[PDB]
Amino acid sequence: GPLGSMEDFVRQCFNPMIVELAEKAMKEYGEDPKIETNKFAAICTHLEVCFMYSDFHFIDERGESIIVESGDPNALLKHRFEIIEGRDRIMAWTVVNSICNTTGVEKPKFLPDLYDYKENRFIEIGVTRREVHIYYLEKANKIKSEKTHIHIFSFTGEEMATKADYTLDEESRARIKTRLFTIRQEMASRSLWDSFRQSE
Ligand SMILES: O=c1[nH]c(-c2ccc(-c3nnn[nH]3)cc2)c(Cc2cccc3ccccc23)cc1O
Ligand SMILES: [Mn+2]
Ligand SMILES: [Mn+2]
Numbered sequence: 711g712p713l714g715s716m717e718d719f720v721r722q723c724f725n726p727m728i729v730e731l732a733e734k735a736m737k738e739y740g741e742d743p744k745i746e747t748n749k750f751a752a753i754c755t756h757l758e759v760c761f762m763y764s765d766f767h768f769i770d771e772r773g774e775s776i777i778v779e780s781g782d783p784n785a786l787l788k789h790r791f792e793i794i795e796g797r798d799r800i801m802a803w804t805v806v807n808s809i810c811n812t813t814g815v816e817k818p819k820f821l822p823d824l825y826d827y828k829e830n831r832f833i834e835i836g837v838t839r840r841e842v843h844i845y846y847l848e849k850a851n852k853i854k855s856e857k858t859h860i861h862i863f864s865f866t867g868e869e870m871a872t873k874a875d876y877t878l879d880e881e882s883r884a885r886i887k888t889r890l891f892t893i894r895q896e897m898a899s900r901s902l903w904d905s906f907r908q909s910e
């Protein structure tokens with residue numbers, strides 16, 4: 711079929727807020743999303759996985775972790791995760807500092823993606839088009855915070871997480887994997903997938 715434009719895909723297939731946060735960050739970093747389009751789509755995908763990981767997960771009135779997908783989470787529920795990804799650098803470190811003061815967890819060397827108030831740890835999310843184990847070791851070797859939990863997703867359903875501890879239930883991780891499958895399938899229908907996969 712005809713070859714689409716990755717920019718069109720990104721704008722048509724990610725929520726405008728995700729697209730905007732990705733666009734702003736690339737621009738501040740000197741990278742043009744109109745040129746580095748495969749990177750644009752990968753940054754949107756990663757940011758969306760961060761949001762989906764956190765979606766619907768609350769700490770209840772008693773302090774247990776519960777899932778609330780309906781529109782109204784009762785007012786006394788607390789969001790289970792803090793989202794650090796998607797914030798500019800100042801706000802991201804401000805949040806990381808606030809967490810570390812509230813909880814006493816030690817401060818990471820690089821910005822992680824999430825903080826889990828139930829498991830009391832920062833999380834680094836990865837999304838890859840290559841093998842998860844090779845991607846996992848790269849991430850671990852970059853940060854080696856050894857308290858930051860690492861959770862890797864691929865576009866074909868494979869996952870790898872620190873100490874075989876996957877944090878979330880299978881239904882939440884299936885939502886994420888189903889979304890990644892949908893992204894890959896739509897890219898492939900637009901003949902974008904080949905360039906996207908090999909671009910990592
Ligand atoms: O884990 C994280 N990953 C990524 C990430 C980065 C690049 C790509 C990619 N894919 N193809 N080309 N580039 C994918 C994800 C990111 C995004 C990211 C990290 C560092 C500096 C960035 C500068 C500007 C905008 C985004 C930036 C964050 C992650 O936790
Ligand atoms: Mn809320
Ligand atoms: Mn990040």
Ligand SMILES: [Mn+2]
Pocket residue numbers: 756823834835836
């Ligand atoms: Mn990440």
